[PDB]
Structure 1
Amino acid sequence: DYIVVKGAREHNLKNIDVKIPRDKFVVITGLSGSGKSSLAFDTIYAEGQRRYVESLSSYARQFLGQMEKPDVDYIDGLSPAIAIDQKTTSRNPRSTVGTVTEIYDYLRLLFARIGTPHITPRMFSFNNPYGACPECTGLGSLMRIDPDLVIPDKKLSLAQGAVRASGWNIANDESYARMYIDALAKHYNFSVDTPVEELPPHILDIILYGTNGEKIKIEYERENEKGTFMASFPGIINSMERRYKESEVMKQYYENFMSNIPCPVCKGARLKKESLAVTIGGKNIYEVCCLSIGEAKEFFANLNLTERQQLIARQILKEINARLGFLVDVGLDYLTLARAAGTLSGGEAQRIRLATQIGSGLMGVIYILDEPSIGLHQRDNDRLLRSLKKLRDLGNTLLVVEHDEDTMYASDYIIDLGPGAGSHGGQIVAEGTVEEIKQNPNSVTGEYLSGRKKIEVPKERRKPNGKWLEIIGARENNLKNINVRIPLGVFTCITGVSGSGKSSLINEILYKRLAAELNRASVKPGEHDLIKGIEYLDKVIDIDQSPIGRTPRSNPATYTGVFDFIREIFANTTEAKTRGYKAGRFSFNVKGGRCEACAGDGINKIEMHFLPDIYVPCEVCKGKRYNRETLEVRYKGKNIAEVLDMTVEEALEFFKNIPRIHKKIETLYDVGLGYIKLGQSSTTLSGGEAQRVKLATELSRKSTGKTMYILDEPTTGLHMADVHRLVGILHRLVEAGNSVVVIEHNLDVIKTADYIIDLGPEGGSGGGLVVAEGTPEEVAKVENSYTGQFLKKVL
């Protein structure tokens, strides 16, 4: 009844031995990068998934690929595990909230059994051709590529760049598209250089919609080849639609070309017109699915029926009521049962998955969670804890990677990693009951819980300088035409209930408009009337969890900007001058200094007969990514490889005599990155490391006092000490002369902010108007505000 793990050597784990009780609420806490996330995800979930897959069918195993076996000696008492995290799934327009939560089938059964006609369960489904809309094929949206978007200027000629779509540009004469267009124009007696405005409608229709089955002969010309062939032109729009039907970035780029409109026939009901005639209680399936969760639950609880109907559909009603109660208890009460699954956030998706899992009721399954208390306001923390306890009580086990102090008191076993991070961390410090870790002086978390060290409340708060940004006519999504006023040069925090519209109001309006008006970004903004005060800003920077580099040719050393100084000081040594070298030779991205065999990568491709290609360290240069000639030059007893393999603390200690490098190294050390190596590849960097690198790069560059920063949930997967460092770095950034706007639900970040904007008072269509604004004390004095009440309670 114990999960005993002996000999774990993944990432930075120093051969730890841990025993975790089963069928109990167990949480794991540690610093950012200390190794808790690796020890959980890469070891336990990976081992469980691989063990379950190896026993499945051969074709299923091949489809799922070969999962990497973790470097662990032996693990016993392991059950199949499923991991729930914040990973949005755009998927397909077919999937909605109703089908994901597994309630649409029950609604179909109820409508078929009881719903009187104005009658089969298969008829009501939009996933089958039996009862789908003939026009939209069940999608409910007539999505087509906008003819005006592909050719924004019809007056401009085709050769001038009329087409603005990838894979269809006619600028290059060597492309097959240009030859096809020329052949079509020759067949239709037209010239390519003729402006589209002067082009006949028939020619434009043929170009944009194919030849309607007509076949023509087009000759092809190559470098040394020639000939003739006969085929049919499919059309630009037809080819684009086929490619879209046949990845995420490419799908998003293609969807940007097209526009989504409601289907004119069924008005986006995804069902046949005859099927909508069936009604129960005066409402059909579409009206029921278009209401919120709370209203739907109230309607179902207040439904009137005879004894025979209740006896016929007792179990259906019980199951629907239980599922709706679980959905309203997990923390969601504003969602609509018809909203597409694509338009959701990470927290909402994770909560929906948790609700589906608890409603389904699986037994003997290990559950892995990744910070479930993020993206949600503090008013639903009790509901989330109750739902998690209910999930645990049925006979499962929970491994919640949570950092909130409230979650610790509700846990039965706490495993704390540390003491530091990276090389310093990776060992188990203390474990046991919450009281034991509270009384344990060897852990930072226990000291924080006991109140030994906490975040103090600032005494002096800055005031706006008089330059205030104004928003007029904000109506994006579920905004009820409200006007807000954000000050400048002051740390600004925006709070509100989950799904109140603050995230949309920020991301889809403010950042997009600022980018379009300042950085010249071709992004369509949201619905707004006008923005006042745009002249007071010069640069806009957005910080997210996306990796800083998609290629292994980048590293934090070159991203921060210290690599140029390192190369200059290496080339300025006596040996380099004697050899007549250059500052560009000490790099692993140009020819001359990097290893020629491995092309400055350190890994060579070793292809196997029946195995995917496996990369091994290069043996020509021992994986140092530098030839032996360059390593002959040494500065202060160290070579370039030693510097690149040297940690940040050692770099700070060694480079104290060079102020122009020490300035950036101090920023890198203070931002929180005290364990990474300068030579670490950017691909393996996690979200926290990327955010820290971006913050350090932003802080390093001098500030002119006219910059604004837009963030989103900056405390995602950060320990309390990490929050205490981040608030200090944000205060330093504000004091530098810039303005920072963040969206954080953490009370610690809010209690220290110099300006609070509240959106509510309820989620969904119920809210959308400003409740209170101003100083934190003023918001606390407000009675009708959850955020104000919590601010008053904490202070």
Structure 2
Amino acid sequence: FPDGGFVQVRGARQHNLKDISVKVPRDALVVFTGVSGSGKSSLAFGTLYAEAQRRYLESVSPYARRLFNQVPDVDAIDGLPPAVALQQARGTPTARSSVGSVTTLSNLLRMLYSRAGDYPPGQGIVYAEGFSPNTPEGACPECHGLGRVYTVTEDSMVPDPSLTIRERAVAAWPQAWGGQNQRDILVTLGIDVDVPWRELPEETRHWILFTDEQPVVPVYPGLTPAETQRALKKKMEPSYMGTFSSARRHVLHTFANTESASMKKRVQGYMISEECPLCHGKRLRQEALNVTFAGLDITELSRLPLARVSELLRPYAEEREPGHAERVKNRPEQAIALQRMAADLVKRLDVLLHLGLGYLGLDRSTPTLSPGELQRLRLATQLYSNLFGVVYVLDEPSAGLHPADTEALLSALENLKRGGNSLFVVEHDLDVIRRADWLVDVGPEAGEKGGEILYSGPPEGLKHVPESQTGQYLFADEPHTPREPAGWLELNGVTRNNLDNLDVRFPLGVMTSVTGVSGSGKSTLVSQALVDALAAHFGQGSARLGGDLAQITRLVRVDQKPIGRTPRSNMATYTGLFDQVRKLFAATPLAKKRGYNAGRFSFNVKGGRCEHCQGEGWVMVPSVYAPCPVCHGTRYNAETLEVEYRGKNIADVLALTVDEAHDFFADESAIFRALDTLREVGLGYLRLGQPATELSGGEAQRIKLATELRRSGRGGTVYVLDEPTTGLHPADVERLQRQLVKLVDAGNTVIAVEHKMQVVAASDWVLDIGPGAGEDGGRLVAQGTPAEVAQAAGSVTAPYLRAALR
């Protein structure tokens, strides 16, 4: 590290950051550490990314991104090169988009299916972006590339095919006159109403149901068919003149033109999700599906794992593909480019693969990727992206990563950097922290008591800081006797993805860690197959339950996913905490004296809230959340704020930290109660009205948990939860474990997917999955007490577990 090889930050203040300074070197693995909530993000993304983002955008687009003056709070940053963020900003959704498109590979075999690729006799050429499901030319024009449709069929419009038409055999039709009209139209149109439906010929039932036709026929109502037929022949004067409307035509048109509650509803009852009948779920025009390569259309290829895709092309790159012989001389132009295309396709593929992302299929949909999977995908994609001289900002690239592969990751970082780039990574993985060139560690604790720089330097240096929470877990190096299973629950013959008719069993009233290499199949076992089975069986693919079911009654399930989308929702809203605070306000002399309803203090309904914001407090103006205008951040009008409980109005308490709220609501029973369950979950740092789209999702998780951690009034529910270590510093996982240890004792089962061994080591039972990932996975390598799995042969995880028990 040469002097003036550094980035110089002075007076950073953003959020809890306590007006601090840091030098951190460019061209190095700088790892940003410290307790959750402490300040790492507000340093790494709040200041460095944010600032560097901005000085650049204003130079590139003096157009109007500069014009957009409404900055991070920071006096100075010297030596800051342009930045690239590999995890999108907190308050954003994820765009709807595929693995292959994130990684660009999708576009690149699109080019390939075009130049190369086997055109059938006599039909032209299909341009690159006509093999895409998201371009007008490429997508099949029915489903629009989605591959699904949402419509009508025989079985939905006739749930009981044995009725006569007169009997309303055609459930999807109108009720009073509407059904009458048509029913009558049919008899006039020489069709017998009075046989059961199933009795009727093909393209008749199909006509009756589907036809976009609408003949206009004389209708003689309440006459018998025999006579209706005769009086037609006499050309006798009708009673009116009817328009026929195919069952489908009603149903759809209705869905398209009503503002009616049970109307739409009852019509959606003749509507089921089923695969597009044009393209058969393969997402593209027949003209694009017509083209084939290694005997596949591109959809087919796209749904293979990257790992196989890397194999399928591999010959072509090396010119050793059976057929190549009778292809070089008889077609030059392409065979040179085809090689190159494949050659280059493999080259990239391979970097992905070396990150063991080999199991993802390129059509896989990024909303359904995890934080890690995705970040590591981005990390791979950048490794060939070709940027030089930038700082990549990373957010726990090790999320999900299993301790054996941490070396492949530690590698891709070394390679990015080795491309003349700089690396800012916030991390908690002691294995990642261990190998970084340079550490920087944040807060002592979180929030108000955080946001100071405890130490910026090489990581060994932390040795000399007694009071760096991460100083300990990193440096200063009671075991666990598994508890007796109170009974067993079986999830049998789960066939899905990876998994194939796998039978499996989890012990009740006790901890289960389901370990295994990343992609080995934890989540489709435990967060997919298991969770569904259990919620189908209770109130709320094609498995069966079995075993001691009567012994469990509920299923709380703890996403990483956010507590809500809009600033509408927020931490108070979500827990039930706000209803008790609105209740309290409506109870005051002042509210009682005025007309005021309970929840005139809702910023979510008309009345108490100011009209500009119609509630929110944050008016949206990358796409970023700059606060309100002319309520002035509050969310409420002048009166509703006039109501004060012990000197604090509604907005006054919403802008209140749980710690302060706990002080405050001291003799207010089920509030001071509810607050403890966040204070214990460790959230004492947060505003009650801090919107959902600002919390770390690690945070979000802590809340959903905060909920159940006192509802357990009768403990016999199952708690299944994906990555509980989500975004927790070591010190944090300890306080986590604590809270689970508790909620197991009140007789509760907790199946937890888990890559960190620390917490597995403490489990009561373990299940190792796969042996490796993808197709090399989906099998049960080992189960039993940690000590028992820790000595198992087959498993990849056993030595790290053994490591973590000694």
TM-score (norm 2): 0.75
Q: 1:153 aligns with which of 147, 152, 159?
A: 159
Name the residue aligned to 2:787.
777
Residues 489, 545 of structure 2: 8 Å contact kept: no
- Partner of 1:699, secondary structure, is helix
Aligned pairs for 1:10-159 (under 5 A) are 10-56=14-60, 69-85=71-87, 91=96, 99-100=104-105, 103-104=108-109, 111=116, 127=131, 143=149, 145=151, 147=153, 151=157, 153=159
Q: Residues of 2 paired with 1:389 and 1:196: CA distance?
A: 76
Q: 1:327 aligns with which of 329, 340, 352?
A: 352
Structure 2 unaligned segments of length 5 or more: list them.
218-242, 258-268
Paired AA for residue 470 in structure 1: E
Residues 140, 263 of structure 1: 8 Å contact kept: no
Q: Does 1:457 align with 2:479?
A: yes
Q: Residues of 1 paired with 2:57 and 2:195: CA distance?
A: 57
Residues 135, 265 of structure 1: 8 Å contact kept: no
Q: 1:689 aligns with which of 679, 682, 699?
A: 699
Residues 613, 631 of structure 2: 8 Å contact kept: no
Paired AA for residue 35 in structure 2: L
Paired AA for residue 11 in structure 1: H
Q: Residues of 1 paired with 2:581 and 2:77: CA distance?
A: 46
Q: Residues of 2 paired with 1:645 and 1:576: CA distance?
A: 21
Aligned pairs for 1:399-414 (under 5 A) are 399-414=424-439
- Partner of 1:527, secondary structure, is coil
Q: 1:676 aligns with which of 680, 686, 690?
A: 686
Name the residue aligned to 2:757.
747
- Partner of 2:440, secondary structure, is strand
Name the residue aligned to 1:9.
13
Q: Does 1:705 align with 2:705?
A: no
Shift of 1:729: 0.6
Aligned pairs for 1:334-733 (under 5 A) are 334-336=359-361, 344-451=369-476, 456-458=478-480, 460-466=481-487, 468-519=488-539, 521=540, 526-550=541-565, 552=567, 555-557=570-572, 559-561=574-576, 584=598, 587-588=601-602, 594=608, 601=615, 615-616=628-629, 618=631, 627=640, 629-631=642-644, 634=646, 644-653=654-663, 661-733=671-743
Residues 49, 393 of structure 2: 8 Å contact kept: yes
- Partner of 2:496, secondary structure, is coil
Q: Residues of 2 paired with 1:138 and 1:126: CA distance?
A: 13
Q: Residues of 2 paired with 1:65 and 1:196: CA distance?
A: 73
Q: Residues of 2 paired with 1:590 and 1:98: CA distance?
A: 41
Name the residue aligned to 1:220.
none
Name the residue aligned to 2:273.
257
Shift of 1:533: 3.5
**Per-residue Cα deviation, 1:228-276 (whole angstroms, up to 9, x for no partner):** xx9x999478779999xxxxxxxxx999723368956999998768743
Q: Residues of 1 paired with 2:166 and 2:700: CA distance?
A: 43
Q: Residues of 1 paired with 2:371 and 2:34: CA distance?
A: 22
Summarize the Cα distance change of 1:2–1:488 in structure 2 as closer, same or farther, 3 Å threshold: same
Q: Residues of 1 paired with 2:338 and 2:570: CA distance?
A: 62
Name the residue aligned to 1:224.
none
Q: Residues of 1 paired with 2:126 and 2:584: CA distance?
A: 74
Q: How many residues were matched structurally? A: 736
Shift of 1:139: 5.9
Residues 305, 362 of structure 2: 8 Å contact kept: yes
Shift of 1:673: 1.0
- Partner of 1:481, secondary structure, is strand
Paired AA for residue 630 in structure 1: V
Summarize the Cα distance change of 1:771–1:603 in structure 2 as closer, same or farther, 3 Å threshold: closer
CA RMSD, Structure 1 to Structure 2 (Å):
5.4
Summarize the Cα distance change of 1:439–1:782 in structure 2 as closer, same or farther, 3 Å threshold: same
Q: Residues of 1 paired with 2:463 and 2:297: CA distance?
A: 56
TM-score (norm 1): 0.76
**Per-residue Cα deviation, 1:406-432 (whole angstroms, up to 9, x for no partner):** 111221111111122222222222111
Q: Residues of 1 paired with 2:633 and 2:793: CA distance?
A: 71
Residues 108, 124 of structure 1: 8 Å contact kept: yes
**Per-residue Cα deviation, 1:526-546 (whole angstroms, up to 9, x for no partner):** 122454443332221122233
Shift of 1:589: 5.3
**Per-residue Cα deviation, 1:40-90 (whole angstroms, up to 9, x for no partner):** 22433334444444445689x68x995853344444444433322289967
Shift of 1:99: 4.9
Summarize the Cα distance change of 1:260–1:536 in structure 2 as closer, same or farther, 3 Å threshold: farther
Name the residue aligned to 1:248.
none
Paired AA for residue 515 in structure 1: A
**Per-residue Cα deviation, 1:649-708 (whole angstroms, up to 9, x for no partner):** 344445555665544333321110121133444454331332222212211224312211
Does 194-203 or 643-652 show the bigger shift? 194-203
Q: Residues of 2 paired with 1:513 and 1:256: CA distance?
A: 21
Paired AA for residue 598 in structure 2: G
Shift of 1:770: 1.1
Shift of 1:728: 0.6
Q: Residues of 2 paired with 1:664 and 1:620: CA distance?
A: 26
Summarize the Cα distance change of 1:581–1:407 in structure 2 as closer, same or farther, 3 Å threshold: same
Does 329-338 or 308-317 show the bigger shift? 308-317
Shift of 1:449: 1.0
- Partner of 1:685, secondary structure, is coil
Summarize the Cα distance change of 1:659–1:241 in structure 2 as closer, same or farther, 3 Å threshold: closer
- Partner of 2:447, secondary structure, is coil
Q: Residues of 2 paired with 1:264 and 1:548: CA distance?
A: 36
Residues 374, 716 of structure 1: 8 Å contact kept: yes
**Per-residue Cα deviation, 1:733-780 (whole angstroms, up to 9, x for no partner):** 111221111111111111111110111112212322211111111101
Summarize the Cα distance change of 1:161–1:749 in structure 2 as closer, same or farther, 3 Å threshold: farther
Q: Residues of 2 paired with 1:34 and 1:110: CA distance?
A: 53
Aligned pairs for 1:191-206 (under 5 A) are none
Aligned pairs for 1:229-244 (under 5 A) are 235=249
Summarize the Cα distance change of 1:758–1:44 in structure 2 as closer, same or farther, 3 Å threshold: same
Structure 1 unaligned segments of length 5 or more: list them.
217-229, 244-252
Aligned pairs for 1:302-321 (under 5 A) are 304=320, 319-321=344-346
Summarize the Cα distance change of 1:644–1:285 in structure 2 as closer, same or farther, 3 Å threshold: closer
Shift of 1:721: 0.9
Q: Residues of 1 paired with 2:728 and 2:22: CA distance?
A: 23
Residues 28, 437 of structure 2: 8 Å contact kept: yes
Does 622-631 or 507-516 show the bigger shift? 622-631
Q: Residues of 1 paired with 2:447 and 2:174: CA distance?
A: 52
Paired AA for residue 325 in structure 1: D
Does 722-731 or 339-348 show the bigger shift? 339-348
